[PDB]
From a paper:
To explore the molecular basis of the effects of this double mutant, we determined the J-1N-EGF3 structure from crystals grown at a physiological pH in the presence of 7.5 mM Ca2+. These crystals contain two independent copies of J-1N-EGF3, and, as observed for other Ca2+-dependent C2 domains, Ca2+ is seen to bind in a cleft between the β1-β2 and β5-β6 loops at the top of the C2 domain, ordering them despite the increased length of these loops in Jagged-1 compared with other C2 domains. The observed bidentate coordination of the bound Ca2+ by Asp140 suggests that it is substitution of this side chain by Ala in the D140A/D144A mutant that explains the loss of Ca2+ binding as shown by increased proteolytic susceptibility, reduced Tm, and significantly reduced phospholipid binding. It is noteworthy that even in the presence of Ca2+ at concentrations that our thermal denaturation assay suggests would be fully saturating, the β5-β6 and β1-β2 loops remain highly mobile, with their conformations varying between the two crystallographically independent copies of the molecule.
Residue numbers in the entry: 32 to 337
Write the structure that this text describes.
Amino acid sequence: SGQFELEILSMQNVNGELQNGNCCGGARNPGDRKCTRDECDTYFKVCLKEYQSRVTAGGPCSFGSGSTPVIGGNTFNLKASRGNDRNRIVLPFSFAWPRSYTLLVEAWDSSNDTVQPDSIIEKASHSGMINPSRQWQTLKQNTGVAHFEYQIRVTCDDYYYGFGCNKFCRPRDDFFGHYACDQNGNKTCMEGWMGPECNRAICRQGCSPKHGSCKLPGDCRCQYGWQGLYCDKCIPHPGCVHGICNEPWQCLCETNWGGQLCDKDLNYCGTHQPCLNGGTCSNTGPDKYQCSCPEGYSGPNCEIVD
Ligand SMILES: *[C@@H]1O[C@H](CO)[C@@H](O)[C@H](O)[C@H]1NC(C)=O
Ligand SMILES: *[C@@H]1O[C@@H](C)[C@@H](O)[C@@H](O)[C@@H]1O
Ligand SMILES: [Ca+2]
Ligand SMILES: [Cl-]
Ligand SMILES: [Cl-]
Ligand SMILES: [Cl-]
Ligand SMILES: [Cl-]
């Protein structure tokens, strides 16, 4: 999600005094009060926590804490230097960044090779607001005897967006989405795709909303029983001749066509003209008729003469 980073820029402790007024090491040469015996072994402690309207010097470091190894003597300047792992403190976070925070930074002196313990040189504290940016914010602690400069920032981890580094967005072209990310981490769909995660293919222009569907953009796949470019037309019953459908597998007959498959001619007389030698045809049912034969003509079609 994100990272709160702090970089030490410079320290200035001309004499080599701690918070308690004493020197780093031993004796202070009388009169001029110069500390000469030894230089401080300066390291930095950092504590990051929830915003406090009224700052406390003690409390749990909610968002994180860390310390630098000894990075210098009494005085150092790293303001034109690059800044490495020894002079910087990284504090990662997975929660959404609240913007408001409380930061404690302290310069300390190492005393592990002696009988006395590690002691505080100076202590810095502030509460503020900071948004995710690559741009460093410089802070000076100069109120006391010892002064130090540090800079802080909050950056979003890869694929994280917004003011809290919480909005994840990584681009795709698979069964879960077809999209690119924009500057705000919003999903902009590829050509042919739609929907919140860009997983709906846009069909053929005019494709049936009720009988057509897509898997890939452009196409129009027909529901079973529908057909045509737009899946607009039903498929009639197989074996249906001289028949239409409204719904699939129907076979609703055309005029003068009867039966299950509209194979039977209800107007055989008109279609074939069967009676010969001046006979009169009359339809007597499906593929049936009868002939009224003139005198001297006999048979089903008046074909028997004399
Ligand atoms: C686009 O991104 C902004 C800020 O990152 C967000 O507030 C907004 O809801 C997004 N717009 C859409 C249409 O998703
Ligand atoms: C039908 O009946 C036959 C017998 C003839 O009279 C025809 O002219 C008529 O149309
Ligand atoms: Ca020391
Ligand atoms: Cl403040
Ligand atoms: Cl300084
Ligand atoms: Cl996945
Ligand atoms: Cl979707």
